[PDB]
Every structure is written in C-alpha cells, then in structure tokens.
Write a protein that binds this ligand. Structure first.
Ligand SMILES: [Mg+2]
Ligand SMILES: [Mg+2]
Ligand SMILES: [Mg+2]
Ligand SMILES: [Mg+2]
Ligand SMILES: [Mg+2]
Ligand SMILES: [Mg+2]
Ligand SMILES: [Mg+2]
Ligand SMILES: [Mg+2]
Ligand SMILES: [Mg+2]
Ligand SMILES: [Mg+2]
Ligand SMILES: [Mg+2]
Ligand SMILES: [Mg+2]
Ligand SMILES: [Mg+2]
Ligand SMILES: [Mg+2]
Ligand SMILES: [Mg+2]
Ligand SMILES: [Mg+2]
Ligand SMILES: [Mg+2]
Ligand SMILES: [Mg+2]
Ligand SMILES: [Mg+2]
Ligand SMILES: [Mg+2]
Ligand SMILES: [Mg+2]
Ligand SMILES: [Mg+2]
Ligand SMILES: [Mg+2]
Ligand SMILES: [Mg+2]
Ligand SMILES: [Mg+2]
Ligand SMILES: [Mg+2]
Ligand SMILES: [Mg+2]
Ligand SMILES: [Mg+2]
Ligand SMILES: [Mg+2]
Ligand SMILES: [Mg+2]
Ligand SMILES: [Mg+2]
Ligand SMILES: [Mg+2]
Ligand SMILES: [Mg+2]
Ligand SMILES: [Mg+2]
Ligand SMILES: [Mg+2]
Ligand SMILES: [Mg+2]
Ligand SMILES: [Mg+2]
Ligand SMILES: [Mg+2]
Ligand SMILES: [Mg+2]
Ligand SMILES: [Mg+2]
Ligand SMILES: [Mg+2]
Ligand SMILES: [Mg+2]
Ligand SMILES: [Mg+2]
Ligand SMILES: [Mg+2]
Ligand SMILES: [Mg+2]
Ligand SMILES: [Mg+2]
Ligand SMILES: [Mg+2]
Ligand SMILES: [Mg+2]
Ligand SMILES: [Mg+2]
Ligand SMILES: [Mg+2]
Ligand SMILES: [Mg+2]
Ligand SMILES: [Mg+2]
Ligand SMILES: [Mg+2]
Ligand SMILES: [Mg+2]
Ligand SMILES: [Mg+2]
Ligand SMILES: [Mg+2]
Ligand SMILES: [Mg+2]
Ligand SMILES: [Mg+2]
Ligand SMILES: [Mg+2]
Ligand SMILES: [Mg+2]
Ligand SMILES: [Mg+2]
Ligand SMILES: [Mg+2]
Ligand SMILES: [Mg+2]
Ligand SMILES: [Mg+2]
Ligand SMILES: [Mg+2]
Ligand SMILES: [Mg+2]
Ligand SMILES: [Mg+2]
Ligand SMILES: [Mg+2]
Ligand SMILES: [Mg+2]
Ligand SMILES: [Zn+2]
Lengths: 97, 63
RNA sequence: AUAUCCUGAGAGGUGAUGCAUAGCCGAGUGAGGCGAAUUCGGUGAUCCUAUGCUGCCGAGAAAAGCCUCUAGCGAGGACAUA
RNA sequence: CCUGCAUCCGGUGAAGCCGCCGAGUGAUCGAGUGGUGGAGGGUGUGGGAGUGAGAAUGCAGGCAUGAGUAGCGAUUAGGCAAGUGAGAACCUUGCCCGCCGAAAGACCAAGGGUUCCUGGGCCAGGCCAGUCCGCCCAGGGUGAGUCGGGACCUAAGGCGAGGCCGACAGGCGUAGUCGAUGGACAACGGGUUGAUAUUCCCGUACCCGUGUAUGUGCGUCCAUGAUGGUAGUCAAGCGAUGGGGU
RNA sequence: UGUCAACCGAGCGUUGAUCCGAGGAUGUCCGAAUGGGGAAACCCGGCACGAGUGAUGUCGUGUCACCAGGCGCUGAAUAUAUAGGCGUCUGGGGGGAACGCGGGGAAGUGAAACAUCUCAGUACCCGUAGGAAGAGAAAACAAAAUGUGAUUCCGUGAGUAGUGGCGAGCGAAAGCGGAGGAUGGCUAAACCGUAUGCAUGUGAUACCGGGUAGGGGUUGUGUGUGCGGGGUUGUGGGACCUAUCUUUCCGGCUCUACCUGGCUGGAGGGCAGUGAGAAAAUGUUGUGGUUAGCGGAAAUGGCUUGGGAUGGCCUGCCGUAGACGGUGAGAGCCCGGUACGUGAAAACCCGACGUCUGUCUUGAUGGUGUUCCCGAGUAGCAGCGGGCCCGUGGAAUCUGCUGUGAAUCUGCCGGGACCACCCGGUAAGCCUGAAUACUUCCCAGUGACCGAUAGCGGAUUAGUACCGUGAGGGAAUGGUGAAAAGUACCCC
C-alpha cells in the first residue's frame, strides 16, 4: 500500500532578488504541487521543520510561450506558495542562502 | 395504432397505383383497437392495444 | 396622546500625542532630517432623508434568509468575561 | 523509353550542355573533332508505349514594359543648445512655441495572451536611416476569512427516471437536477520596490467555527407550584423538509 | 547514457551492461463515464477503516448509477389479490477498413421532349451478429425412360423460349459438366404412471388379465396443467387383442397373501463422450510448429592506371553456398549472408495416450381384425399491392393486409385456367460442419510500375500552417565531399 508523507508536496525553491529580500525579512517562497492546498503547505512545513508558522499564501502563473522553427511550444505551469515564519524566527540553514 | 402487443403484427408497405398507371407510395396498417384484456380470472383487466385477429381468435378472452 | 416603538439624514465627541502637506537644512539616477497656521462667510448640486410625499393607468418576479407557531426531540444547555 | 537475345565501348573519361567542321530528298545525322563534367552506354534483330505542342481568355515556377512615374494612409507645427555613437531633422537631457482637454485624460466588464520590467544586438519587420520599438534573445515578475465568482437561492430556457404517441429511427412532457443581466452577505486611511496592492507593512475594525478557564446561573434524581387540586401531562433547551407573517 | 542536431558536465560495465523473446505492477484526468455537479481534461460530498493536531480545519485505501431477468420479504384505495415498495445474485449501454441478413428508400440522365419504364432496388439510413453468413433433409423436377434423390457455388444451356407507349430496353428454367461429402438428427398425437388443482360421487359393486378370497378409495366418474416409458413414416406408419420365436441374477410393486401375464430398482457385457443427436469436471505424449538466437566453405596472388581497385592482362581455389546489399570506381573467395545444418526458459494451439458421464440389455425377431392419431384462425375462397420474362393481362407459384372460412389415409396438395384418368409427395415446430465472400493488423516475397510539377494530399514541422465562427477546404520546401579536414594565420 502507498505511504503518505508530508515531504512529497513541496517541490523546489526559487532563487531571485525578491526571494532574497523576503528571506531578509524572514519570509520564504516554495514551489508547490498544482493540486495541493494552503493547509497542505502549512501542516507539512510545520511538521517537517518543527518551527511554528504564522500564515501562508499561494499564487500561480501561466506558462510562457516560446518560438520554435518546428512550431509553437509551451513550458510547464507551476504553483508557488509564500510562507511567513512566526515570531520564533528560527533561520533555516538547508536553504543555503 | 402501430402493432399488436400480442402477435406483433407490424404494418406492411406497398405501392399505390392510379388509374393512369402512375405509381405512388402508400402504407397499410393492420386493424388494431384499444381493449381491456381478459387473462386473469381474478376479474381485473388492463388497457392493452390488440388486433381484430387476436381478439376474434380469442387469444385474449372476452369478459 | 409627537403616548409608545421603529427608522433615520445632517450636526456634535471618539478614532488622531497619529498620518500627510506648504516650507527650512544639508544631500542630487535620489534619499535623509526638521517642519508653521488649519478660524469665519457666500454659491450650491445630476448626491442623502426617499422602497418618503403628491398625482396618473396601460395597474406592475421568485426563492432563500429573518421572526413566530406548534408537531417533534430532550438532560445539558443559555448568557457574559478572559 | 523499357525490355528477350548476340555483341562492343568506358576513371587512358560513359550520360547533358556550348562551339567548329561537315553529311541525307524529310522528320535530321556524325564510332569527326574542341571546353564542363564525373558513372554507365551504342550498334543488330524481335515485343510493349503515359512515345513527339504554338494557340483552349489552360495550370506550377521564374522573368519583361507603366517606372525609377504615383504614392509614402488628413482636417496641429515644430525650432534650438548639449550628449551618445561610424553614421541623427525622426534616440536621450535642457529651453521656447503649438494642440487636446465631455478628451487626443483616469478607469471597469467583454475582448488577446506575455505586448510588463531588467539586461543583448540590430542580416528579418516599422512605407526612408535607425543608437529605438507593440523585433526578437535570456532572466524575473501576478500574495485576499472582508474585491469579482464557486461552496447560498432563483427566470426565459435546456435534460429528463417512470409514461404517452409513433412501422424503426424518433416528438412530447412529471418528479429533480442545471442555468445572473437579480436578492442576502462581514474593512477603511497612509507607506513601500524596476515590475504587486481594499492582497505586503503600519494603525485601527467586522463575520463565522473549535478548545481551556472563570463568573452568572438553571434539572434531570428532591419537590413548591399552576391546574385540568389524590394521581397523569407539562412550561428548561432545542425546535422543523410542516403552517403563518415578513 | 533513443531520435530531431552538434556541445558541455556528469557516470556505469568481466560480479555480464545495452538488446531482443515470454509473463507479471504500478497506470494522474477526460472519454459509454456510472458518488453528485458541468463550457473535455474542473468543482462539491456521504459511508467505513486507517494517518495527524489540546479539538475543527487535513490527508490515504475501499465503497456509494440506470435498465432487464431470476430469488426472498411485503400486499394500498380493498375483501380475495394486483400494482407498487425493500434486500440479494446474474447480464447490457461504446468502438471497429471490407464481407452478410430483413426493411425503408430517392433525383441528374435515354427514349433527340415526355406521364409508363430505365437509371435501381443504385447512394443513404435503420435493427442486427459472426469469422464467415444465410439456406437445408422434397407437399422437387420430368413424362410413360422400370427416370433422378438435402443445400450451396461456378461453366454451359443463350442473348435463344418471352416481355415492352411490341419504342428505348429488359431477361429465365429444365438438363448437362465440375468443388463436397453427414442420401444427418431432433420435437408435439394416438396411450399408462406421478405432484397437483377445478369438480362432482349411486361415495359402492365399482377402480385391478383368470381362480380362492378382505375392503370401501391406486376416488366412483369427468376436465386443464407439470413430470417419465412408446413411438417418428410414405410400398403408410403408429397405438389395442390374438399365435409363433425368445441369446444374465435378485428384490419391491400390478389394492392385498397364494400360481399365471405386466410396472420399477440393485449387480456382468457391450455402447459412445466434448459431439447436432445430454451435460460437468479430474488424474500421464509429437525434433508437432511458432514467439530469439548459433555454426557455416575459398586469393593480404603478380604486373599495370591510378587519390583511392571493387578497372585491364596473367595465374589459383570453393561451390548442397556465382540470391541480395555494404565497403574510397562493375567483388563467388573483404564484411553483413545466402545452400545446408542446428537450436528454447516460458507460453500457444493442435493432434495420441489415461479417472469420470449417460441411454439401452423389464428386453429384441417375423404376422391378424377390429376402435383412436399424424403440427388452427391454418389451407382454400373474395377484395387490394409486391417480385418471379408475365408492364392485370386467361393469370400458375410465393408473399403483405382485410373479411369469410375447411377435412384426417377411398384425407390433402402438386404436373401454368379448368374437368376426367394417370404420376410424385406428406406444409402449417426446431438444429446441423464441407464445397463460397473479404482485409483495418502481422510475417515472408514479386514489378518489360513512378523517380521530387511524377509518385498516396503527405521523401521535410502533415492532415501541420493557413482559410472559413460550420459542415469543411487544403498548401510549397531531397542530392557538398571519403571523411568537416566547414578554410588556422595575415590583411581591407
Ligand atoms: Mg512560436
Ligand atoms: Mg404498434
Ligand atoms: Mg418494397
Ligand atoms: Mg418511380
Ligand atoms: Mg436635484
Ligand atoms: Mg535508359
Ligand atoms: Mg567492358
Ligand atoms: Mg575518370
Ligand atoms: Mg577532360
Ligand atoms: Mg566529373
Ligand atoms: Mg530484338
Ligand atoms: Mg519496334
Ligand atoms: Mg494492343
Ligand atoms: Mg499517353
Ligand atoms: Mg512551351
Ligand atoms: Mg501564370
Ligand atoms: Mg508594365
Ligand atoms: Mg509621376
Ligand atoms: Mg506626388
Ligand atoms: Mg496612413
Ligand atoms: Mg533628431
Ligand atoms: Mg480640441
Ligand atoms: Mg465636455
Ligand atoms: Mg464629444
Ligand atoms: Mg472583452
Ligand atoms: Mg480574461
Ligand atoms: Mg515594453
Ligand atoms: Mg536592443
Ligand atoms: Mg535593422
Ligand atoms: Mg520589412
Ligand atoms: Mg526581446
Ligand atoms: Mg488569495
Ligand atoms: Mg422538465
Ligand atoms: Mg428515462
Ligand atoms: Mg422532458
Ligand atoms: Mg440549472
Ligand atoms: Mg447568474
Ligand atoms: Mg489595490
Ligand atoms: Mg515485454
Ligand atoms: Mg497501483
Ligand atoms: Mg459515468
Ligand atoms: Mg453523468
Ligand atoms: Mg430478473
Ligand atoms: Mg384479491
Ligand atoms: Mg454493438
Ligand atoms: Mg431528346
Ligand atoms: Mg427527352
Ligand atoms: Mg430492375
Ligand atoms: Mg461466431
Ligand atoms: Mg442449411
Ligand atoms: Mg426453412
Ligand atoms: Mg442460360
Ligand atoms: Mg440499346
Ligand atoms: Mg411422451
Ligand atoms: Mg415423443
Ligand atoms: Mg591505379
Ligand atoms: Mg577486379
Ligand atoms: Mg546480383
Ligand atoms: Mg562492400
Ligand atoms: Mg549497382
Ligand atoms: Mg552474422
Ligand atoms: Mg406484368
Ligand atoms: Mg396475369
Ligand atoms: Mg398439364
Ligand atoms: Mg409411385
Ligand atoms: Mg406432412
Ligand atoms: Mg463456403
Ligand atoms: Mg530534377
Ligand atoms: Mg473554421
Ligand atoms: Zn394480434
């Protein structure tokens, strides 16, 4: 039978200037499965990183559309989430800046 | 007014001929009427379409 | 009976020792700091009282919700504060 | 042209193309010669043809004149100094002048999808040149318990379990469920980066749910009461798929 | 470490990678779609069991249509009972290039027009299953031959006998010669038994073949239905009595005990079996083939032109292998393989060898006169239409509809009206392989067929771009060379 684990929903981190600023202000931004949920993100993140979380947010964007001499192609569509840590403010080292 | 529910006699199709020997389409339909069938001795009957052939032969009784 | 109830513009206090701004200092792809007075009249709405009031006939949606009634369940439930 | 048969030629240059020189009464011919090329061809005798172009206002592809002629798509109109760079009247900065302003401005829904920002260049495009672009390249960018929708309700209409009718195929319509341009429903001011704001932050609000504690505090088990007054019900607290108001 | 199409960084492999052959799991969502909803791939739940929080919020695995047919319970107005309602099992909803069966079913056009005709029972649609289908065991032909003997499919029989505004056109049968063998089997009626009911009974001298006898129910006597024997046919056959011949043992029955004649069970010996004639399962063979592979003969020959020999001349060898491709220019002896041999873990199907199933031997053989049977709104008749050459004409035969409506063996129907005499046959119930029709797919082969405006629309981004809101329409785009060694470097 299948085994459910809270570590199978969040996909990957995103590196950018805005993400670095939000990290400076103690806010992280993850990439989350298209069919997941805010409650999924909150429960999984708190369980895995044993750090109290205050609030979460989610947002999705459509994929780009690039030209190709063969024809027209489309990239993948992704759903990303925003997590704001509680007053505990336990920095995460696994992010690696 | 299409078919007997008992014997299942469907309408037949043929060609009608005028006195000028010109052809045209026409249909014949068997004589069927609404009657209440006598099948159960209990004394109850139900509305079922029937044909004169079946009625006269008595496949559904008269009472 | 302006009895009693409901509604309710506008006015008044609170929100505000807060925020912002005319300006003054250095400082220029620009940021920082400081920062006065804030009283009285006229005009006046297509906006509010208003699902108001007055006239007219061609005579003008439903469900949900809310209140209530019992039918019926019922020994824990209701209110207030943190 | 393809084929049966028997033969000969060919990296010491076979097939087309462009000349010279010649030849047959014709449709033409040259195992006679020159340049280009690189891979299969000719003669003899039989068999089979998608076997022979100049015209159908024929069709596919390429190219002539009119022609370096008309235009370069309004009712406002530009000018100057400096800068960038090889190139500047058409790009950037500064100063004058004009125009619009019930719009030539600021926004919503419908409508398109990456046209938004950053960084790169200018063989394709912009009716001319372009350092520029709604050109393209690479990366980045879209934050709601309260805004618009769904989880709330319905109309004109569509589907339709049963059923009726119909030779078959099929037409109808009950119960129900679908269908906003409507009804009800709880947040405002200011600041912020190259791109986000009633979403982030600051300050103060409002509406539903769960847990713990506390205080008002009422009954189940005692029993006063009202009674219809020994006994049987009960008014606590919820309360409708039902009735009635709104 | 697939490919378009280079390039980088990363790695595995003798402990057997990659590959191919067979079987096995996962298999998001939509799509008959079936927990409920809906604009395809998007929204919302119930129930049970588990995971997580101080509790809601959350998450995993199952399950939650409709219809029809069995089985069980229940029984409204309303009484008998039905409809209807609940529980549980079994089946169905769609797709597929061609091939079949039964229906419906058109108009252009020829007749130099055109109504009849023909185009045509064509296109299309409907309901239908299979790998093939349908049809099929004479109520068949012919004509004095002492003939054929189920059905189907081809060639003749002939463009003749016929038919038609006797125009345009349309078009058989019998017989004969071929492919195959199964000239096969079942089922209702005449009569006994049995669960029954509807009944009635002289309820007693009748139900049982004779005799001795007990009694009043194997009801005394009728009716319709379910269940087992005996029968299946044309020179008619089948049921009842009467003689003859009769190839195992025992028991209980023909009301009953005793002898005679019949019914039924338990044991030899044959009979077949996946079969149409009855159906279910369980125990031991073919180098049978197939899904991969493996073995497999002979010149580095010499001289020459050459960038390259697989070109020319001269010498050898193999041939159960000189089919066909690749390799720097036409290769039997360079490579891939061809002739030939082998060869499979698993699985497939065929065939053969083995427990088990079931009728019969309580029964078979040849005769006789008497009483009953041989498929019901059918055959025939009358009216209106079809398709057979037959275009209502004298109209035979088959068939659709409406009325009327028959008989059971000296009965009935057929030989193109009809009568008489002859001759053939036995419809009104059901199965049946072999001869035949076709390719969406796979395997192996062939071309006096095309070579980039030809060839399928498609040798490349293909039913794409593009056009049209829709059904739909529908494009053009190969050759460097042996290898890229794709021109370092210098100069404008
Ligand atoms: Mg594109
Ligand atoms: Mg009918
Ligand atoms: Mg017809
Ligand atoms: Mg006609
Ligand atoms: Mg006014
Ligand atoms: Mg040739
Ligand atoms: Mg030669
Ligand atoms: Mg050469
Ligand atoms: Mg040369
Ligand atoms: Mg050449
Ligand atoms: Mg010849
Ligand atoms: Mg010739
Ligand atoms: Mg010829
Ligand atoms: Mg031709
Ligand atoms: Mg020409
Ligand atoms: Mg042209
Ligand atoms: Mg011209
Ligand atoms: Mg001019
Ligand atoms: Mg001009
Ligand atoms: Mg213009
Ligand atoms: Mg300029
Ligand atoms: Mg103006
Ligand atoms: Mg104006
Ligand atoms: Mg105006
Ligand atoms: Mg719009
Ligand atoms: Mg939109
Ligand atoms: Mg831009
Ligand atoms: Mg640029
Ligand atoms: Mg340019
Ligand atoms: Mg251009
Ligand atoms: Mg760009
Ligand atoms: Mg949100
Ligand atoms: Mg309806
Ligand atoms: Mg239905
Ligand atoms: Mg309906
Ligand atoms: Mg709806
Ligand atoms: Mg609406
Ligand atoms: Mg905003
Ligand atoms: Mg496999
Ligand atoms: Mg699975
Ligand atoms: Mg479904
Ligand atoms: Mg559905
Ligand atoms: Mg059933
Ligand atoms: Mg009853
Ligand atoms: Mg089907
Ligand atoms: Mg004519
Ligand atoms: Mg004509
Ligand atoms: Mg015809
Ligand atoms: Mg089949
Ligand atoms: Mg048959
Ligand atoms: Mg038949
Ligand atoms: Mg013939
Ligand atoms: Mg003719
Ligand atoms: Mg019998
Ligand atoms: Mg029988
Ligand atoms: Mg050489
Ligand atoms: Mg050689
Ligand atoms: Mg060869
Ligand atoms: Mg080679
Ligand atoms: Mg060759
Ligand atoms: Mg090999
Ligand atoms: Mg006729
Ligand atoms: Mg006739
Ligand atoms: Mg005769
Ligand atoms: Mg005879
Ligand atoms: Mg018969
Ligand atoms: Mg066949
Ligand atoms: Mg060419
Ligand atoms: Mg279109
Ligand atoms: Zn009938």
């Amino acid at each position: 039978a299948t085994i459910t684990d809270p570590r199978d929903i969040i996909l990957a981190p995103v590196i950018s200037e805005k993400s670095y600023g939000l990290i400076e202000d103690n806010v992280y931004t993850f990439v989350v499965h298209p069919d997941s949920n805010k409650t999924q993100i909150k429960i999984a993140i708190e369980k895995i990183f044993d750090v109290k979380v205050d609030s979460v947010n989610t947002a999705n964007r459509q994929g780009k559309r690039k030209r190709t001499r063969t024809g027209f192609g489309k990239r993948k569509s992704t759903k990303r989430a925003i997590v704001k840590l509680a007053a505990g403010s336990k920095p995460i080292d696994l992010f690696g800046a | 007014a299409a078919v007997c529910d008992i014997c299942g006699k469907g309408p037949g199709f043929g060609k009608s001929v005028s006195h000028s020997h010109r052809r045209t389409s026409r249909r014949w339909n068997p004589n069927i009427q609404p009657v209440r069938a006598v099948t159960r001795p209990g004394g109850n009957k139900q509305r079922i379409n029937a044909c004169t052939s079946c009625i006269k032969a008595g496949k559904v009784s008269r009472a």
